[PDB]
Amino acid sequence: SKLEAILSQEVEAEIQALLQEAEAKAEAVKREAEEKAKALLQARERALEAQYRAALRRAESA
């Protein structure tokens, strides 16, 4: 009915805004995890490059 349409539409739009809040929360969870992952990858690559430079210096000394 008409009042069914009113109640359903209004508080279902409230539930939809709640779902948008939940999706924004999940995106904020994923963003910092991606940041930590890429920072770990970059630090690993930096440590590897320092290791290879030390290996080249050892080969030069030999």
Partner: protein, 51 residues
């Protein structure tokens, strides 16, 4: 002659419940009723409205 005293049933949402009870209480010509036992709760009102 006693007036025939018809029944008035209303429904809706709850912010509109407080607002229409305001607009019904400003034009105060209606008597009330409990209307408990069938399919609905006893309506414990709110904690903040109780305060």
């Amino acid at each position: 002659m006693i007036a025939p005293m018809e029944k008035l049933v209303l429904a809706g949402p709850k912010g509109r419940a407080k607002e229409l009870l305001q607009s019904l209480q400003q034009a105060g010509v209606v008597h009330l009723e409990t209307l408990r036992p069938e399919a609905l709760s006893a309506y414990q009102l709110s904690p903040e409205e109780r305060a």
